[model samples]
Target: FREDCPPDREELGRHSWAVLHTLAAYYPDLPTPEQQQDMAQFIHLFSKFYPSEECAEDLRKRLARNHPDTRTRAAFTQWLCHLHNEVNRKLGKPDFDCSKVDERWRDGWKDGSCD
Candidate 1:
């Protein structure tokens, strides 16, 4: 019963962040042209079809302001990190350090919490 409930807004937001950060972490350091195009296409579709109409519209506006940067892993990760910080700011949450994006998403902290 507890597990069967559909996701609430917070649950969906967490899942969305997990997917986006994980994808950026694994993105190629130097992506091919086709890979860049495919990733941009995916982002466009994601914004279009996200569960929350409000969230989807927000993402669409942001994309219009600055399209996805898919050229390199660093570029993609930093772009997303900054975008996330904007959301954090709006929510009055502490912002994550953009410099530590790879460590946060993939490498784990130096203190080995993920270990």
Candidate 2:
């Protein structure tokens, strides 16, 4: 999808969890499943960790009546992108692989480390 395209709430929720799980596996210092679930709930309630603009808008409309400030939303977006990149690098995947799929990440684990 284009960068201008925004993902809906459900899509964002799923993607957020995907990133969380990948990070957990990569860092080995992230929360466990139970803790992660709890953290997700906390993020959902706060609306300070949305996955995309659409997700943020959905949360603002449905949850946070006041809506988040621009700074807060921008911070969350940056954090999510950074987290995704960290996981991708740890898993030897490309940060912005436009291809639908690639064998490099799947086959290069043996080499260990992205470099």
Candidate 3:
């Protein structure tokens, strides 16, 4: 018997947010044109192949509508948090406070849990 099972949708979604939000947390504050373009392309392509086609379509629509505002790292990071909150809303989950994003993702919590 398999001792460890593969990830489920919930597991995948939670960790996927960790990856994307962490990336956004580290995105350049003042990106060059190529940097901006690269992030945009990555997100668009990520939506296209999300595990669930129907949900992927929903994400694609949201992405198309809101688009990315990648002028600065804080702006882009918070923008991603906003979109994640939207997804949370869609799932009837509580919103992640955008203000605490850096603490949560990059710098760790104020309590020094990451340390």
Candidate 4:
């Protein structure tokens, strides 16, 4: 009911995933060395300071298991989607098809709905 109030973990998690996906979708197809390092740093810092302790720690462990693949736009985007699916699986949510990432995040749906 309170729009400006601090978010609960669920709200934070939802928005966090939205932002992460959007960023990956817009990332450059052939990023420079500097951009790669910057993206890596941002992801690491974000996981360290995420609002929810449990989720933050979970993310840190995930990173240790599968570091972010910032090599290219396709690589990074798909990697992030895979990571998101891991969380979804844990939460008993259905997997989001990685193939439709651009359609969902950048180009809009195949139908003219988002247009």
Clashes of each: 0, 0, 0, 0
Worst 10 residues of 4 by lDDT: 1-10
Work out the TM-score per prediction.
Answer: 0.94, 0.27, 0.90, 0.96
Best by lDDT: 4
Candidate 4 accuracy as lDDT: 0.95
Q: Rank the candidates by TM-score, best first.
A: 4, 1, 3, 2
Per residue, candidate 4 scores C-alpha lDDT tens digits across 1-115 of 7699988999999999999999999999999999999999999999989979899999999999999999999999999999999999989999999999999989999997998
- The parts of candidate 1 lying over 4 Å away from their true place are none
Local accuracy by lDDT, each model: 0.89, 0.45, 0.89, 0.95
lDDT by residue (tens digit), candidate 1, 1-115: 5987889878899999999999989999989999999989998998888988878788789889988889999999888888888788978999998988877899998888889
Q: Write the per-residue lDDT of candidate 2 for residues 16-99, one digit (tens) a residue.
A: 655643333332233456654554455566465564666456545644343211233233334444444554575597785323
Two-way lDDT contest, 2 vs 3, winner: 3
TM-score of 2: 0.27
For residue 30, what is the lDDT in candidate 1?
A: 87
**TM-score of candidate 1 relative to the true fold:** 0.94
By TM-score, the best candidate is 4
User: How big is the positional error of residue 77 in model 2, measured in Å on the Cα after superposition?
Assistant: 0.7
